[PDB]
Structure formats: structure tokens, C-alpha cells
């Protein structure tokens, strides 16, 4: 069968259909905070999400994606390590069966309960499908989630998950503000990597924020109630949909902060 997160179709198997799995710039990675170097020539990140136009939420059998209208520069990321303008197309998360695992990136081997990815494409390539084939085609803003107090900006997401329980279900999801998912600080690490799901393309500039957001136990519990399977198929809970840390292979991780 096709790719997943189980014993039989999970990350150890991906390289047979996607040989770039064993490539030179795979993600995620462990961020060693002692080895990352402060890079004085990194600009502050510019997250311009005021005109973000959310459309839909979809269970794609791997995660759920909240999709945005990316036909114009309505919600963009720029600055930081980036040249040019990257448009927000979707966000999703990765999460664990337990609070001690679920992030894809780790920080000195520490795993967080979950990780949010805000996926952007480089507008100089005109569309997302062309952008994913270029080495500077994508920029993913990664945010760690720890369990603590509730994140009020996440609750609208939590509330709709009932309606997209199984693979292929979608719901209308307009007027959601992705600014409510950000922590206070935009301090970050950055390195060149890849998509963390098949087809594992090596087209991502990763920007991983130093400050986690806190979500509540009840919020993450709702994520764990989703299903990987389709309606009418045997229930497999959507948990542990993360890829483990890949070798760094002499890439340098840079910090925006001292
Ligand atoms: Zn992701």
C-alpha cells in the first residue's frame, strides 16, 4: 500500500518509493542549541498575515490541513533568511500519542507534544507545484507545542475536528486568523531542508521558532481523536504522525538570537 506512519508503511520504509529519503538535506533535524551559531546578518522575520484568507479544513489521511487563498499576496512571510516573498498556502500539525513525543524537530533531543507547520511557497516560481521543485521554493515556519494552558487561537480549529474525522472529509473554514497561533517572540533557528512527508522534496528553508506555544491537554486530546482511515473502514487513530530526526550531514543551523 502507499505511505503512512505505521510499522509497515512508516518513515523507515519511505526510501523505497522516495529515494531522496536518504538525501543530503532531509528534515526534520535535531537542533543542537550549543552548536547553532548566532548569525548577525539575519533580518527579523516579517510575518504579514493581516489579509489571510482561510478557506477549508481537510483530513488528508496523514494530518489535517487548513488551506488558504494563495492567488494573491494576502498572507506572506518574508525577511529572516529569505529573499523575496513567500505565500501562505496551508498549515498543519504533527502530534504524538503521548505528551512526550509528537514534534518532528527536536531541541537538544527534546521532543515536544506537537509541531505546527505554516507552509509557504516562493512567489517567483508562480505556483506551488513549480515552487516545490526548486531548492528555494518553500519556507516552512515551524512552531513547537507544549501542553499547558489552552491556546485560545487554536480553539476554532479544535471545534471543527468532529466534522473531519476521517480521510477525505473537509469542512468550510473561513475567516480563521493564523496570527492567533504564534508565540510572542519570533526568535528562530534556520537551516536548509526538505518536506518531512513524501515526496520529501529538498526545497524547504526551515524557520523554527525558539518559543513554543502552550495548548491544553483537552485540545491535544481532540487531535488524537481524528482518524487516519476513511469513513466505513476500521478505525486507526491519527497519532504519531511525525518523522524522526534525520542526519544533519554537515549543514549548519543558524540562530537569529544570542
Ligand atoms: Zn509538516
Care to describe what's here?
The protein is mainly beta and 258 residues long. It has one domain: Carbonic Anhydrase II (Roll). Helices cover 7% and strands 29% of the residues. It has 3 helices and 15 strands. The chain has helices at 128-131, 155-160, 217-223; strands spanning 30-31, 37-38, 45-48, 54-59, 64-68, 76-79, 86-95, 106-107, 114-122, 138-147, 170-172, 188-193, 204-209, 213-215, 254-255. Strands 2, 3, 4, 5, 6, 7, 9, 10, 11, 12, 13, 14 and 15 form a 13-stranded mixed beta sheet that branches. The protein has a two-stranded parallel sheet with strand order 1-8. It starts with 29 loop residues before the first strand and ends with a strand. Residues 92, 94, 117, 196 line the site of zinc ion.
What is this entry, summarized?
The protein has a single domain, classed as Alpha carbonic anhydrase (Carbonic Anhydrase II, Roll). Helix content is 7%, strand content 29%.
Separation of termini? 47 Å
What molecules are bound to this protein?
zinc ion
Give the strand tally: 15
Largest beta-sheet characterization: 13 strands, mixed
Query: How many independent structural domains?
Result: 1
Helical content band? under 10%
| Secondary-structure content class | mainly beta
From the spread of the alpha carbons, the general shape counts as: globular
Discrete helix count: 3
CATH topology: Carbonic Anhydrase II
How much beta, percentage-wise? 25-35%
State the CATH superfamily name: Alpha carbonic anhydrase
CATH secondary-structure class:
Alpha Beta
CATH architecture: Roll
Radius of gyration, rounded?
17 Å
Order of helices and strands: EEEEEEEEEHEHEEEEHE
Amino acid at each position: 500500500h502507499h505511505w503512512g506512519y505505521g510499522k509497515h508503511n512508516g518513515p523507515e520504509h519511505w526510501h523505497k518509493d522516495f529515494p531522496i529519503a536518504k538525501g543530503e538535506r532531509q528534515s526534520p533535524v535535531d537542533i543542537d542549541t550549543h552548536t547553532a551559531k548566532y548569525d548577525p546578518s539575519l533580518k527579523p522575520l516579517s510575518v504579514s498575515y493581516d489579509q489571510a484568507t482561510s478557506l477549508r479544513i481537510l483530513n488528508n489521511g496523514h494530518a489535517f490541513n487548513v488551506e488558504f487563498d494563495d492567488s494573491q499576496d494576502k498572507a506572506v512571510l518574508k525577511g529572516g533568511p529569505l529573499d523575496g516573498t513567500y505565500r501562505l498556502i496551508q498549515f498543519h500539525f504533527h502530534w504524538g500519542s503521548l505528551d512526550g513525543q509528537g514534534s518532528e524537530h527536536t531541541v537538544d533531543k527534546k521532543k515536544y507534544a506537537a509541531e505546527l507547520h505554516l507552509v509557504h511557497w516562493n512567489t517567483k516560481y508562480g505556483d506551488f507545484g513549480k515552487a516545490v521543485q526548486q531548492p528555494d521554493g518553500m519556507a516552512v515556519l515551524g512552531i513547537f507545542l507544549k501542553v499547558g494552558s489552552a491556546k485560545p487561537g487554536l480553539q476554532k480549529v479544535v471545534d471543527v475536528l468532529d466534522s473531519i474525522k476521517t480521510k477525505g472529509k473537509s469542512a468550510d473554514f473561513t475567516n480563521f486568523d493564523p496570527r492567533g497561533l504564534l508565540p510572542e517572540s519570533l526568535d528562530y533557528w534556520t537551516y536548509p531542508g526538505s518536506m518531512t512527508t513524501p515526496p520529501l522534496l529538498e526545497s524547504v528553508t526551515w524557520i523554527v521558532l525558539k518559543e513554543p506555544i502552550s495548548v491544553s491537554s483537552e485540545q491535544v486530546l481532540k487531535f488524537r481523536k481524528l482518524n487516519f482511515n476513511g469513513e466505513g473502514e476500521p478505525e486507526e487513530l491519527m497519532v504519531d504522525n511525525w518523522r524522526p530526526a534525520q542526519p544533519l550531514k554537515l549543514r549548519q543551523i543558524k540562530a537569529s538570537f544570542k
